[PDB]
Each structure stands twice: as structure tokens, then as C-alpha cells.
Amino acid sequence: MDKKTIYFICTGNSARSQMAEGWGKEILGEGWNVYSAGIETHGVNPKAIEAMKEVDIDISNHTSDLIDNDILKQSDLVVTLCSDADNNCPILPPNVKKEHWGFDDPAGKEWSEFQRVRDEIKLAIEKFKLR
């Protein structure tokens, strides 16, 4: 049937959302459109690219994108990764199917933190697929 769409959103579409897009494409498959966006665009975090390369997933061609209203309104599920009280978190429109998936921000930390968060996101998406 028709493709379903998942949208991972956060502050700068930099790390958590990029690793989620990378895992999402691999796990969910071609029957899903797997996108990611931010309220700002900070570029794809180098350590996030390296963390995904370690698990044989290439995210070097990903782009850091801004939130698109036509993808929010037409998505089957919008997943917020930006911590609700943290700083600069995106405002979501009403009736849009949403869930908050909380993972620690690996920004400015050692590569091990990117590995930890990468793996927490892996399991979250794997379990999501099996719902």
C-alpha cells in the first residue's frame, strides 16, 4: 500500500534526528518516508556520521533541514527529540500525531555518548516497527 511517513524533529537537525533518520531508513524500509528536520539547521554532526559508519550506515549524504509544514500535516507520526524544557524546542500544530522520544543530547561530548544514544535510538525504532 501507500507509503507512511515518519518525521524526526528537534533543534538543529544535527545528531539525534540524523541517527534516527539513518536507522529509520534501514529498519522501517522502502514502505516508509523517513525524514528529519529542525527549527534551525546546524549541519550534520561529524560524530553522528562517524557513529553511524561504525554500524555500517552511511549518513554522509543527509542534509540538515528546516521544518516543513506540509510534511508535519501529512505525516503519520512526528517524533520530537528536543527535550520539552531544555532549550529552543519546536512548537507542534494541533491534531498531528506526535510522540516524544527522549534521548540525551550528545552535543559537545565524547564519541561514546554518540554510540550510546545511537544504540538507544536503534532499539526505539526497532520496537516501533514491531508495534
130 grid coordinates: 514491531
> What sign does the CA torsion over 14, 15, 21, 26 have?
positive
Alpha helices, H only, the chain = 16-28, 46-53, 69-72, 111-129
Of 39, 89, 107, 124, the active-site residue reads: 89
Residues 101 and 81: their CA atoms lie apart, in Å, by 6
Catalytic residue among 6, 7, 9, 10: 10
Give min distance, CB of 56 to K ion, in A: 20
Query: Which of 11, 14, 36, 45 contacts K ion by CB under 5 A?
Result: 36
- Closer Cβ to K ion, 65 or 119, answer by number: 65
Q: Which of 1, 16, 2, 9 is nearest to 97 (CA)?
A: 9
Check if 89 is active-site.
yes
Q: Is 14 in the site for K ion (CB under 5 A)?
A: no
Between 33 and 83, CB nearer to K ion:
33
Residue 75 contacts K ion per CB under 5 A: no
Which residues are part of a known binding site for K(+)? Answer: 13, 36, 63, 65
Catalytic amino acids? 10, 82, 89
